[PDB]
Design an enzyme around this catalytic site. Sequence first.
Site, PDB file in Angstrom:
ATOM      1  N   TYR A   1      -3.819  29.236   5.878  1.00  0.00           N
ATOM      2  CA  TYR A   1      -3.544  30.458   5.098  1.00  0.00           C
ATOM      3  C   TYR A   1      -3.974  31.686   5.930  1.00  0.00           C
ATOM      4  O   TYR A   1      -3.142  32.282   6.612  1.00  0.00           O
ATOM      5  CB  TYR A   1      -4.169  30.460   3.691  1.00  0.00           C
TER       6      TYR A   1
ATOM      7  N   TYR B   1      -5.695  18.963  15.194  1.00  0.00           N
ATOM      8  CA  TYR B   1      -4.308  18.920  14.807  1.00  0.00           C
ATOM      9  C   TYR B   1      -3.748  20.328  14.924  1.00  0.00           C
ATOM     10  O   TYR B   1      -4.116  21.220  14.164  1.00  0.00           O
ATOM     11  CB  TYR B   1      -4.193  18.350  13.388  1.00  0.00           C
TER      12      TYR B   1
ATOM     13  N   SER C   1       0.810  15.673   7.631  1.00  0.00           N
ATOM     14  CA  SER C   1       1.864  16.464   7.009  1.00  0.00           C
ATOM     15  C   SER C   1       2.842  15.549   6.287  1.00  0.00           C
ATOM     16  O   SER C   1       3.101  15.745   5.111  1.00  0.00           O
ATOM     17  CB  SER C   1       2.590  17.301   8.044  1.00  0.00           C
TER      18      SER C   1
ATOM     19  N   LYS D   1      -3.607  16.011  18.115  1.00  0.00           N
ATOM     20  CA  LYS D   1      -2.187  15.813  17.838  1.00  0.00           C
ATOM     21  C   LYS D   1      -1.509  17.168  18.058  1.00  0.00           C
ATOM     22  O   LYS D   1      -1.726  18.078  17.257  1.00  0.00           O
ATOM     23  CB  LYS D   1      -2.004  15.390  16.371  1.00  0.00           C
TER      24      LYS D   1
END
EC number: 4.1.2.51
Lengths: 298, 298, 298, 298
Positions: free
Chosen positions: D108, D134, D45, D163
């Site tokens: 999405y 993630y 990110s 993560k």
Amino acid sequence: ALFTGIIPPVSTIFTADGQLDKPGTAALIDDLIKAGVDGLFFLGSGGEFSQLGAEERKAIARFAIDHVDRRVPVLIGTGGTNARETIELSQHAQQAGADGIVVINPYYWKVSEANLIRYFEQVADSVTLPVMLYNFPALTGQDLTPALVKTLADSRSNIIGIKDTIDSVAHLRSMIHTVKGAHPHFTVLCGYDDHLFNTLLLGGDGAISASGNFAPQVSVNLLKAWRDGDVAKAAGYHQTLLQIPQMYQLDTPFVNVIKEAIVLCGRPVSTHVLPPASPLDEPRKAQLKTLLQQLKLC
Amino acid sequence: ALFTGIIPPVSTIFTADGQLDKPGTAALIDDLIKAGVDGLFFLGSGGEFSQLGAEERKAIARFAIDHVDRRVPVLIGTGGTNARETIELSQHAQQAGADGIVVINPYYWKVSEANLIRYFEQVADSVTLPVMLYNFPALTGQDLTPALVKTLADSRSNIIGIKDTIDSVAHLRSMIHTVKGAHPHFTVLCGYDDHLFNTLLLGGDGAISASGNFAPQVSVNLLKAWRDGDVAKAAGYHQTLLQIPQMYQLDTPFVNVIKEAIVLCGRPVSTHVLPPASPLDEPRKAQLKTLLQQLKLC
Amino acid sequence: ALFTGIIPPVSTIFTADGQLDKPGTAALIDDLIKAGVDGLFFLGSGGEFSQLGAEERKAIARFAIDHVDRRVPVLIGTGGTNARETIELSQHAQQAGADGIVVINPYYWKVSEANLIRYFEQVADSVTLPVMLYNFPALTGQDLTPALVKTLADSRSNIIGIKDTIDSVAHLRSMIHTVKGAHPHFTVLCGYDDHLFNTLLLGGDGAISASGNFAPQVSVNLLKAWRDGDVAKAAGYHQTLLQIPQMYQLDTPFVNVIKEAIVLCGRPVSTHVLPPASPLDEPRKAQLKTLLQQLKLC
Amino acid sequence: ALFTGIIPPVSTIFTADGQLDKPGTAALIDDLIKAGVDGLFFLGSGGEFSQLGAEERKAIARFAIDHVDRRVPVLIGTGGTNARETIELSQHAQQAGADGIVVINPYYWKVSEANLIRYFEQVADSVTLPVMLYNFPALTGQDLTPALVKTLADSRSNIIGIKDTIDSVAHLRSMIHTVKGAHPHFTVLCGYDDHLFNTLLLGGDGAISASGNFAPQVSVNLLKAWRDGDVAKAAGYHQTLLQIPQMYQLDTPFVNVIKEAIVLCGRPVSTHVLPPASPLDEPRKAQLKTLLQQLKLC
């Protein structure tokens, strides 16, 4: 007022190996135009924009625009999370001959209000085309409030409508009073089949909803009936659109279901969808069929 | 099917010092009966059950039941977070002569599924009356899913309906298919004015909504029109009910607004509300007035 | 700074038929005082305030206050949805000899900001006692933001702390910077066992958490260790408190589990809980036992 | 156990016109390696993967991999909404020499469970590399539950960590008990600076968090201290990491802030960020500076 009435979020037809199925997508476009729709919207959610790369989406847009050949208005969905790419695509859409673009809010990061307004301003400036906003908080996790949409219409004269994809009368009612209250010719379209009727009675303008792909007549006729002042007739159609959304519960994403419905409703096309979507299993295809039959749509 | 049609969540009228205003609440009951409603529901949300103590709620119920004197069916809302108290009140409601009870899910703790079913079973067993469930996830933070409601109807023969207070067509549609699909005479009523029309067209049964207190004719007439097969007429009324819920944005809680509307619509009653609610300020009272006037309700 | 350190949300012990178990609740109080706690909080969530009637809660409070006999500070949780009742109880608490009150935000209606501030002001005015706020958004569905809590501390000099029941470092950190930043002696306590350590290192003040009832030594020792500047020791205890909250996953509500843990940890008391809660089944009681054993608490 | 310890989500440095700033991003890599980190994660990110096109992300990955030249392990974030693109990039990452990949759930559409498992399986199969999941529900709107993550680790032997970017002790605790409970060498890293300490004490493995970019020593030292059995020291560092996340409140997205912090902490690099992000205004840059000074990081 631009882009009113029934404007389907057209399904992008793919081959078994994942390429644009031009004969099939063209066949689909032609049915829909023939059905009396007021425009077409390519590369929306149901068009699978979020599973296509930039270049692919350019190619689908140019084909679609070309095949429509100006018979009805064409909208191209150019949104995503990559702002620079949103401008590339939006500009390309103009170059390629589109009548306007449809822009969802960036949906990965829920961006600050200042940033969000600046984003929409920047994209609206990058083109001379009409810009239609696209709200879908269920997926975006950030609602385009009527306040914010009023702010955006105040800010840029080419931000001239919105597709409000939400199962909420309040949101649609508020969108109309706040935004149309300040800008009478601002378009408000709903994103769900079962809200078209209410959206009209609230003084909104139409729908871009999935049932346009396989039962466009119901929405087209509802609209004609309503414009002809025959409300009872319009409600008759509403009643069908009220039931239709059961189908969409069969899978997620339900682009597979929409395409499968297109087939069952008489248009044989490839139902291949892009991953992470998958083919609809046989049991649920038959369920879809029974549903379409109960509603008298095949 | 029990408790169908238009059953208002009657406002409890209070004096300036916070006691039951018997003349005024009686006057209100009488208007509503006169208007052609199919029942009355005392001590719902709009009745302010959550701001009254046990004993007060007993007193309001017995008065209300007595004043109605069997002219229409009477429902008493007996819910809360204190299960033992829910039984006291529900039993008291029976012996006081009520026709059924209305039970919301415990709304402090969001209780385990097993515990939730056991709660509803226990209360349904504590009485021989019809039990009407009450969903309001916006406030409760725990939705009564159609699956769960089917489970509850399967479990106890006196759990015979639900007030679904939610701005969602999908939820109401699903509640009907899942529950009525298994129990045709299970009642499903909607909690919001703007959903009455759709709730009928989906094969649901009516509404318990706030506009019953000050504009009961609109919902009553919508229902008669629909039953008479005059749909255009029904839609005409729907259109008013679509706009009405703007009023409820003037405060939260908006029990003040409902009572103020009762006055403006011709029934002079004390609008005192219980804390933590407060009187509606003057500016917003006038706004309410302009809204009622626009809609032709005063 | 008032009400700092380790202040358990004491469990209310009941008999089989649901009355106050005085011998048992007294026994529990005595253990906890003997363990070195810095106060006691009766009629919090874990005290089951939301399943007791007004009169019952009055009775439990006075008994508790009396039995403590001023050996430590006593807090009484007087909150609910019925504002007038919140005042009755809060005033009664003062008259009964309590050192302060603990007030959650009304949790049925999520009340307007203006109304919410007016509610808290009104209750804080109805007593000369210290008032401790109580945030629990998971259950209330309305967060007491640090901004709002700063506003309330600015508004009334007797609003002097908060129990922040939330699994969020950010919320606790922000609560400390925003509120303590403006009011250094404002107390900030966390509501969960696994946040006590961080809450201290952030410059907060302690905890009111469930593990106080059955393993009060761990939190008391963590605090003593931290105040003695021995951090490694404090972290040692943190490590246990980090694991403890697995049990609470055995049921919902998990008051049954806390009381069952009190027993397994050496204090034989009646574990009856009020509906809609229920007894913990045998399988899960044994799982609890294994957990308490692994952590070396029995 | 693969990819344990301190692995920063490295910031991608850009020039004014938006290209990869190779001198600058190389300088950054070098500081971080020099600081003692246990790996590097590019195109997370904070790397701005969601604002870069496929080809750009390819180019950044190889450059990064090459410049690291195997000095530490390198992870490449290959995720997005376009599954086919996720495979292209993941495969490219392998051919380019990466040590593993980091794959977020499609954000999405919130995809069906069956589809979600099938997605993750398909990508894990497209490579022989280690795959690191993630989770970031705040942004994705779909949580990777510990149950689901256990399922995925059971399904594919190269799905070997996660993560977990969430401000929740419960989620991290559960992720460790459920997944590590079944797979002891499954890696669990946290996504936020203020959870590193707890994540270790729970028997997790480290952190990929933003403060790695500008204050990597704090996390590296915390980890060394903890491994050396000196807990008091580790808590000392925890205390700084507890305060750090205040800054991230200065904007959204806060990539600008991270990059600005890199500069203020001694590494002069271009802070250009990709739209819809924007530069940090002057007032807030100075606020950042005051914060970094208070914490003794510059």
